[PDB]
Amino acid sequence: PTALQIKPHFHVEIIEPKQVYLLGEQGNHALTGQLYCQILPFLNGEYTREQIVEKLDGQVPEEYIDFVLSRLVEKGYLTEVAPELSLEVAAFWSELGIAPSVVAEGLKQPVTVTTAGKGIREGIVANLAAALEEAGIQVSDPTAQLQVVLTDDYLQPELAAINKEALERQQPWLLVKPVGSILWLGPLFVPGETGCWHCLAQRLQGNREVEASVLQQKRALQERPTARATLPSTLQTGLQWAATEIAKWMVKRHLNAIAPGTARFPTLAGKIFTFNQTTLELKAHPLSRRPQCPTCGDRETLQRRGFEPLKLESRPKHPEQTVQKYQHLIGPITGVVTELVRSRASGLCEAIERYSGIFQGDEPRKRATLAELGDLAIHPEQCLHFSDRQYDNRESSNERATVTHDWIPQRFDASKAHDWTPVWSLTEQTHKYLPTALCYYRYPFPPEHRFCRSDSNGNAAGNTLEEAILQGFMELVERDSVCLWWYNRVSRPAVDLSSFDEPYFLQLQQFYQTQNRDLWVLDLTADLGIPAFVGVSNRKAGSSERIILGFGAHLDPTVAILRALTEVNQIGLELDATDWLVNATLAASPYLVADASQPLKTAKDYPRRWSDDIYTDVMTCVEIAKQAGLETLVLDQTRPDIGLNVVKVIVPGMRFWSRFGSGRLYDVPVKLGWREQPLAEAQMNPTPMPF
Amino acid sequence: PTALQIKPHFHVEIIEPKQVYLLGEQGNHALTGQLYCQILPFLNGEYTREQIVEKLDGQVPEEYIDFVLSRLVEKGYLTEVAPELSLEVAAFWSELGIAPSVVAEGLKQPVTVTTAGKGIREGIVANLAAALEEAGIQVSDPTAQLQVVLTDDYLQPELAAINKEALERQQPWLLVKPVGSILWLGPLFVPGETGCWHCLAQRLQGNREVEASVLQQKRALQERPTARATLPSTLQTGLQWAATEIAKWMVKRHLNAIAPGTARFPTLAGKIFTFNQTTLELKAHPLSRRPQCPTCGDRETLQRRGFEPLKLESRPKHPEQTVQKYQHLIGPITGVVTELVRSRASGLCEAIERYSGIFQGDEPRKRATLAELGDLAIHPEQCLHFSDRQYDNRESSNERATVTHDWIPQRFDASKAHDWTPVWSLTEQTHKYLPTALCYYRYPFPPEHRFCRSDSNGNAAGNTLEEAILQGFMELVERDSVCLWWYNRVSRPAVDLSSFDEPYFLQLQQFYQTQNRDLWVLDLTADLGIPAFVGVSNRKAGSSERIILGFGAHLDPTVAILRALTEVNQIGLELDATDWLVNATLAASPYLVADASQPLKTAKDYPRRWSDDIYTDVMTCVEIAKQAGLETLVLDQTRPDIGLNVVKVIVPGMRFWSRFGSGRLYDVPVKLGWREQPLAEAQMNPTPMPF
Ligand SMILES: [Zn+2]
Ligand SMILES: [Zn+2]
């Protein structure tokens, strides 16, 4: 004995001869047939199927009633009555696509309600307790299958203990912030399946840079934490919304116990919702479960990988689609990167890239002295190249530091022990060791002994390790080439653009003439032979030449040039710190002038060395550097939670802005016959730049 | 005597020597100065300014305290205490950017609560009544300055009376639907300022095409309406959310009474919010106040304009930005057009265009007989051109109607009177009269006497009337030209594309060869001399030629051709009803084959007649038609609420698909020497098409 009805969220309207309409606030349906008009009056829940046959005795034979009833179940218009529920309520659950008969049993299980901070008044729990009772849910004192945790802040310290309890009890729990101008629901944490609270917290702490900083400064000071807007109406909204959601999750829980994957409607599982009361904005923030989560995952993950050998494969060459792939990382709570991003998928990769570099604590390392590590170790000076002068004058020079670059660090104390991170030598196929402080952003030093500032030179991302490695390697040769030129102020040959098989170069050049601008490309290729170029554009008239520079390096010189022009273009577009743009002149800047005593570079002056494989090109690159007497090192910074590959390529010896130690910077010009004698440190280009 | 405090939504953290941080959940701020650290301990609301001077007597001179206090007011960090409020509550209002001291006075005014339908249980009012009391608001039996109206449907008939009451009482009222799976707040209607409920309703009825239709069918049947999902938790959410919002509006109301435009935070005024409980989606829907609203506006607006003469100006020639301009029209409730739209700003204009055509009831017209109107009237047959055969066989032909086109209407009964709409004759500068049924979509006929079906031929939109008029005129000549060709199956000369000064034509042509396709353009120009073309692409190999056709007409033949190729391209892209694509062949379709007995059309065969002015071009067009013996009529369908110009250009005599009455269709071929004798009706191209 079990009555049947057209789902209670439909208003049935029968238009006699042959029409029936099912009207619902989130969807309508029509049925066509004289049979439907004759049966549906009895599908109001007041009749069991045995009993519908009685009423249509002379009208419709049983067998056709059965068939029509089966049609309606298959079409999802028919459900078993739920006597123990309002139609109002039954309708809600049926509007969700669920047998309301099932619901009473799903909700009869108990739920417990608790607080995390000290910032939740006693009555607020009682309030929620009431709403849940009114929704048909058992509540008890902390057996329970859901623990609801009311807090005023998701970084409340107490949650760490609570998270552990729930992990070791395998017990779902739900966070709710009902106080404040923005209401937060979830995540509903489910120990086998979702992230833990610590998955959330290492991300959220990353989006409270300030609040962390104040706390630190407050603790330093010590012995020698928040406020909250709340109308009763907003409080009550949040609690009531939560009750709705808890209900939904318990019904889902139930259906799925019975039939795994049967219930598809959305719940708070692994999700946060924020409802802003001042700006009426609703937003979803998805919690990712972090594979390397120290609490609920494998902390040693990166430690392990760092000491395993690097594994590179073939990568033949067979968008804004990227932004979808890494969408779940864009956000103020749940995300690692914020805003819209920073086409823009370029600034997204770079933001994600920079984040990956930030030292979390799990990174591979060994505490040892330089001596202990022996030849596998690399002295940081082999990568920084600050002159002895720079260091000794570091104090006076540092006070005035024009730029973030011109911070001279402190000298490395080799005699002391340090964290050393393993990095893969492609050139020698072994690990070597670089100090961890050079390898990751924000490595925590002892205060005084800051021996470096991490820098992003050689850092790079890609959808594969090999794409990233070539990116980072070319970023390196671009800056080593620009440094050799800029600082030695070297007169360089220009490039016949027509000779290249790219109609765009000459076209863009010409276009600049209509916009009151000249444009040459100088050749910055140095002893690696890898094509490197500057684009020099100056204004034609006006009282300031406004010289804009743009760089590029690639195996294919055409690619390299295109990048240089693109950079000039992006800068040029922005314009309309320093005073280069006001003061610099070709007339007073010989190194910006093409060497007339040397012929123009054509397409034919660049021996081709790039191939269909990116692996091949990496290894081409490595060999080239070995030819120069340089070891190509790589460090994978990729994070399992993020997915996008991030590397730091390191080629010790290769030169970066603002560092004047002995090395290539002086020797290469001479070795290449740009000079009889090396230049002196005091004669290095004192103009600050480029860009 | 009136105490001062740092706004209660900030958590003040003083870091002794020189730092102070104001921490708030929607924004942080830092202050720098030893003075701030010394004064801010006393800006906790416990001290009047007279009293802060006492405490810092020996420390800080009065004058500097005053200055610092003035700084903090100017910077918006300081507010007068509100004794009669929680800090919790004060904080909410300060997080909104408002003196909490002001708030108590704003809320002390009374508000009344009521129902619209029969579908709001008694306790629901009491529920909301309670929430408002708890929020500090007076509630009374229906003096009041806000009437809150709980309903289960926004098209509830009772609202019309309520809307009138409020209009004649100049009394704000707020609609709320707290029942159902989706909660609706607002609009808050404000009689001088917002739309009325009828502004909302003519739009909303437009988005319930079905629900209207069921109601109609139900009433026809008569004497010979909805359901609603509701958990207590969802009900309570909506009521509580509303209380929040009502509060906000009353405080805004208050501040602005005192200082017009002082309060800038958002309220429900002229807005609907929907909060979906099943999919957790929050959406805003803005109510537009309709200038021609019969209830709160000027009904006679269009009536008036229709009989005033058309006013066209100069329009010299000096994007997806359009989609922003008409964004407020895209939506299921408030909007006229739905979905995303239908680049896409093309399908938006067309959707808005079609909507404007729909007969509302306000359109200009005169009830008269053909005879009464005399020569100013135009017989619909002069615009439809159905053959006598078509009409007499209308019954047999109609049963099987292949297409929406092949509905043969009924003959016009001239002897009877009809609604006649005035239309502007550009050619004669007077109004003429066309039956209203031809002029607007969905004109309500008496059932039997349906003498036409409205059609969109000559309909067109633009950001100015003149752009729309040229669009609609060219759409007309495109279809008159294609009809003459198609139906008479006329062999036509091809077009030398190289001869045109457009490198793209030859390039696209070539591209089609790589995609297994040929492509010619035939010249469809007829006796108007206005350039009109078909693009004919056929597959090269495969067992079905899959011939795709694309049309174009413009004064500039290059523009016209470009349109033809673009159309071919859009169709071609879609492919990968009828069986043309399977069965049609060049071999069996002479009219698709270029006439070899006639030379190829070059750029030089098209006398240039377009100019810098669009007005000039309209009038060029009109003159050309007058030369052909044709009156150019225009009817502005633009709606004041929508803004985008929409016209219908009518040129009686010019031919449309599927209509075989005596006229141009037979006479033009002969007049142009394409035939010695006119073709017979039975010999008209019987293949159905084109597209
Ligand atoms: Zn975890
Ligand atoms: Zn109105």
Numbering used by the authors:
A (entry chain A), B (entry chain A): 3 to 144, 156 to 237, 250 to 343, 355 to 378, 423 to 656, 667 to 781
Task: Tell me what the authors wrote about this structure, in their words.
Domains 1 and 2 of TruD share 21 % sequence identity and structural fold with the enzyme MccB, an adenylase found in the microcin C7 antibiotic production pathway (MccB catalyzes two successive adenylation reactions). Pairwise superposition of TruD with the MccB structure gives a Cα rmsd of 5.4 Å over 219 structurally equivalent residues (MccB lacks the third domain); individual domain superpositions are much lower due to a domain rotation (2.6 Å over 80 residues and 2.0 Å over 152 residues). TruD and MccB possess a similar dimeric arrangement and both share two CXXC motifs in domain 2 that bind a Zn2+ ligated in a tetrahedral arrangement of sulfur atoms. Both motifs are conserved in cyanobactin heterocyclases and these motifs (and associated zinc) are a conserved feature of one class of adenylating enzymes. The coordinatively saturated zinc plays a structural role only12b, in this class of adenylating enzymes. Domain 2 of TruD shares the fold of this class of adenylating enzymes; other members include human ubiquitin-activating enzyme 5 (1.9 Å rmsd over 134 Cαs) and thiamine pyrophosphate biosynthetic enzyme ThiF (2.1 Å over 142 Cαs). There is, however, a subtle topology difference; all the adenylating enzymes that share a fold with TruD have an insertion between the first and second strand of the central β-sheet relative to TruD domain 2. Significantly this means that the ATP binding site of MccB is not fully conserved in TruD. Domain 3 of TruD is a novel fold and has a large negatively charged central cleft. Structural data of course do not establish the mechanism but they are entirely consistent with TruD being an adenylase enzyme.
